[PDB]
Write a protein that binds this ligand. Structure first.
Ligand SMILES: Cc1cc2nc3c(=O)[nH]c(=O)nc-3n(C[C@H](O)[C@H](O)[C@H](O)COP(=O)(O)OP(=O)(O)OC[C@H]3O[C@@H](n4cnc5c(N)ncnc54)[C@H](O)[C@@H]3O)c2cc1C
Ligand SMILES: Cc1cc2nc3c(=O)[nH]c(=O)nc-3n(C[C@H](O)[C@H](O)[C@H](O)COP(=O)(O)OP(=O)(O)OC[C@H]3O[C@@H](n4cnc5c(N)ncnc54)[C@H](O)[C@@H]3O)c2cc1C
Ligand SMILES: COc1cc(CCCO)cc(OC)c1O
Ligand SMILES: COc1cc(CCCO)cc(OC)c1O
Lengths: 525, 525
């Protein structure tokens, strides 16, 4: 059957598709099953079909976005705006609401509008990937560096708009986002901050402007379609050194985190975003599961010791990067060695001390942590046939016992559902993103359903323990927002009220972050 | 005559006042003219009466705030929430809309709810002043320090809610704000961030929570009455050093700013928030105008030279503070001396090198920049009889030509309207707050009217040159929001839609930031 927007007939949708073609050109509207396969979730969750797009519209300009939104309002067509649509682990480009039209802004709105060397910023359209911006900075001999997530094929804008993160001192992308332009849900266009002052040169200099500060309301949001976004860019330091600390025992996690916090909270000596990855995460980056265990069910401890011995890695592997003059780097590395060396069996390696396969992750972090984008971690998806992943990322206090509690709770459910537990604590100043990647055979419908049921269990169990997730997959958005229900669901009620005011026809990404416009509430999707 | 809410009769207002007394206690409702005199703007702007409160209500609890908001909805009573109501320069405690009832949350909601040494944060009620928090930290021998504005008698919460700023590395108060509790305009209570997840310990560790990020919409805002707010607290460094650089000429401003930017953008060597204050600003802190000049009109060049000579200060005076191990401080100070020394006439002083009257401001900055609150700057108001100030604060790029353009533009109008121009550039990473404090005799109605007309001209003239203000006085809020009118007033229309959705009866601080609810729009008050 043809995927159609809810309540929209074949005739009405054909008519809307043609109005879209009038705006963007016939080449830039996709609506056949073969064309749309590329836009389904690449890592499907659940046995049954879900998150089916009805079309893809690729606008060239803000003016075209406004016209697309107005047409969607006339026809009642839901729109899922994306930048590059590489939100893999959280749905890809696929809409939360099946039948929605994807607005792929980044296909043609892909210009670097400004890179300012003096004030250190960029003004970007959504199609600028991290690779694109890196190539620009390299080609202009820029003194600036970008901040990228693990995979460079995503969007500087799009990643920020889901509050994604990277690993340099500028790792909080939303923090350094400065100014945006957005098409509101009925087609009006708005600039935030100093961009609201005509002729201001400070759109990318001063984020707040005047009055209530709105930009965060357009992140993890369905309140508009972003068409331009500014971001601050850090100056590249004169030198850097990355390092790996291997820790032998599962149980070391508690002491690692507790030693880490005093070294991190003042952004020195731990200047970048430390990451603490387990052996499964690192092994998946350089090898397939069957090299260590080709049997049924969870991997046995003998197979784990082999992974560690052969890759020369610990169960927990701490990656960091230091920046600045060589003397500062040496002083900070000495402090780090002296602190973590109090853990029995810890071993230290700089990026120049490992040329072996187990050191491939360290080399990859040394790129990433220096704003050099990479795709090396895509090899994690070769762990099993037809590999995909889902991201389960609860927030943790930077406390070793809390980390251990979360590790044990996730590992337990992981084992129960026969999914390997790849873990990476991504460490901020006062919080940790406990990244749980579950890699699975996306062609196997029982594996897909196990992933869905396992993660719904984990969302509930984590919440009963006081833990919430910072970001989540289409399939989990209602469940995750349901956990943030202090005061009889006060937060969601507030969001719904704003959603219905700005989007009275219920057009933009219905269900994003569990926020449904009035016409869709009380339904089973 | 008695001050009444718009459209509310004496009999209705009396009934509402008694309902307020039911909630908070009859002792905690003020409504006579003598009682309300203290809640008038202490630095009145304009000759005519403006911004008159009809009553003051002091709630003891969030539950009482909810009840007050419910009563106000029933009766159509506008409410102006304040914490400590010390917003001097911007209206004091006085409401934008005359006839509003001030809700002074800080009078009785004044508890430090938590200070966490390990993770470095505080959870505060609105009545905690900077002095209160400092005394707590001292009393408990805390390793943490606060970040305060120039005057310590304001509210850690209230200052943040107007996006006020201080001068340590944590000087962006809203940035370090983490979690809040707010009573929405119809009386519902909501927690943001991880506080929306019942049982989370991360309310003050991770600001975003899940879904659209709303906390900024409650700053410079009329979308609620905030009852609790968290804020991160920096660890106190092992050592510090403050310094003053004096520069001889008005025209040095261009070179000072251009030398400063490379030293600031990486947060080192200029680690704190530098301030660049002109001789009028520093002279007012230690002396009266008639010490230097008792004639008519703007101060002549020779009197300006006498201020410089006796106080041993420049026309421009640069104040900074360095932090960290003693060798790091000495290396950074050497970098700062080498850079700024290229300006002919520059002279350098650390806080150890001046014990004269001219050095009083340096010693005060050494307290403020180390989280030690002060009221010394209140002496600026003794510059002339019955002294008050208004804050005209355009944002400037950190560019010397732009700073000079703004200086010359403001000086030109200050001279025209016979107001001394006290200037302080408060310097962020990529932007400066160009603080123009105009000090005037508040008893002189012509001076008050000159201040109003001069600043209205400056708002328009600055906007014509592409500059907007970050914060403003009641009397200028409509004019300032009117300058942020890109896209035919798109930003204000967006704020108005949200305002009417959350506040359908138009109760909370109508006209704050130029944002009026439907029932008042177009009424010219
Ligand atoms: C192995 C692996 C490792 C990963 N590591 C990381 C990591 O380190 N850090 C990280 O952050 N992520 C990580 N991810 C997740 C994902 O790869 C990235 O976050 C990716 O950059 C997001 O996709 P994107 O940039 O194309 O954004 P998009 O998919 O274009 O956008 C993401 C979402 O933002 C919203 N949005 C986007 N554009 C607009 C717009 N114009 N208007 C309105 N709303 C919009 C929509 O809700 C959209 O679904 C990882 C994934 C995998 C599989
Ligand atoms: C000489 C001088 C120097 C100054 N220097 C500085 C400086 O360095 N930095 C600086 O930031 N300011 C400065 N100011 C301005 C002012 O002194 C401070 O900002 C002061 O801290 C603000 O008053 P307050 O803290 O009592 O906040 P309040 O007056 O309580 O609140 C300010 C506003 O925030 C909102 N608000 C407050 N509480 C609530 C609540 N509970 N719910 C909802 N909304 C609320 C209201 O709009 C209120 O009007 C200066 C003023 C002068 C005269
Ligand atoms: C920090 O946020 C994320 C980190 C990773 C991988 C971290 C590997 O060390 C994946 C994500 O989504 C799939 C995230 O959101
Ligand atoms: C940085 O923000 C402000 C600074 C000052 C005075 C700075 C003196 O050096 C006053 C203000 O309001 C009256 C401000 O908002």
């Amino acid at each position: 059957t043809r995927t159609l927007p809810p309540g929209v007939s074949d005739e009405r949708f054909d008519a809307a598709l043609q109005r879209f073609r009038d705006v963007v050109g016939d080449k830039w509207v996709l609506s056949t099953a073969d064309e749309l396969e590329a836009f389904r979730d690449p890592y499907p969750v659940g046995a049954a079909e879900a998150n089916l797009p009805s079309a893809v519209v690729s606008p060239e300009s803000t003016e075209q976005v406004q016209d697309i939104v107005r047409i969607a309002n006339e026809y009642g067509i839901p729109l899922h705006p994306v930048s590059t649509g590489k939100n893999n682990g959280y749905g890809g480009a696929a809409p939360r609401l099946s039948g929605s039209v994807i607005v792929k802004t980044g296909e043609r709105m892909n210009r670097i509008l400004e890179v300012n060397e003096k004030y250190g910023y960029a003004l970007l359209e959504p199609g600028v990937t991290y690779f694109d911006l890196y190539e620009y900075l390299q080609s202009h001999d820029s003194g600036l560096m970008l901040d990228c997530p693990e995979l460079g094929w995503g969007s500087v804008v799009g990643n920020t708009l889901d509050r994604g993160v990277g690993y340099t001192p500028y790792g909080d992308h939303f923090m350094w986002q400065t100014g945006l332009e957005v098409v509101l849900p009925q087609g009006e266009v708005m600039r935030t901050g100093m961009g609201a002052l005509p002729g201001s040169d400070a759109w990318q200099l001063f984020p707040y402007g005047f009055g209530p500060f709105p930009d965060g309301m357009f992140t993890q949001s369905n309140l508009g379609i972003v068409t331009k976004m500014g971001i601050a860019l850090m100056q590249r330091p004169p030198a850097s050194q990355s390092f790996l600390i291997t820790f032998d025992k599962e149980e070391d996690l508690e002491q690692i985190v507790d030693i880490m916090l005093p070294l991190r909270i003042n952004m020195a000596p731990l200047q970048n975003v430390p990451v603490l990855r387990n052996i499964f995460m690192d092994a998946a980056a350089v090898s397939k599961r069957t090299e260590w265990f080709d049997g049924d069910g969870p991997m046995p401890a003998e197979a784990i010791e082999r992974m560690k011995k052969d890759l020369d890695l610990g169960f927990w592997n701490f990656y960091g990067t230091l920046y600045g003059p060589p003397p500062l780097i040496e002083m900070y590395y000495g402090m780090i060695k002296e602190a973590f060396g109090k853990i029995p069996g810890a071993r230290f390696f700089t990026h120049e001390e490992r040329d072996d396969r187990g050191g491939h992750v360290l080399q990859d972090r040394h790129k990433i942590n220096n704003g050099i984008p990479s795709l090396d971690e895509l090899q994690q998806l070769d762990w099993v046939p037809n590999g995909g992943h889902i991201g389960f990322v609860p927030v943790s206090a930077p406390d070793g016992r809390e980390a251990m509690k979360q590790f044990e709770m996730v590992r337990n459910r992981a084992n129960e559902y026969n999914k390997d537990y790849m873990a990476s604590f991504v460490i901020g100043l006062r919080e940790m993103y406990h990244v749980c990647l579950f890699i699975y055979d996306t062609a196997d419908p029982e594996a897909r359903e196990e992933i869905l049921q396992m993660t719904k269990v984990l969302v509930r169990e984590a919440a009963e323990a006081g833990y919430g997730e910072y970001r989540t997959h289409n399939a989990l958005m209602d469940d995750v927002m349901a956990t943030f229900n202090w005061g009889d669901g006060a937060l969601l009620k507030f969001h719904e009220k704003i959603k219905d005011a700005l989007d009275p026809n219920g057009i933009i990404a219905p269900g994003k972050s569990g926020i449904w416009p009035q016409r869709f509430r009380g339904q089973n999707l």
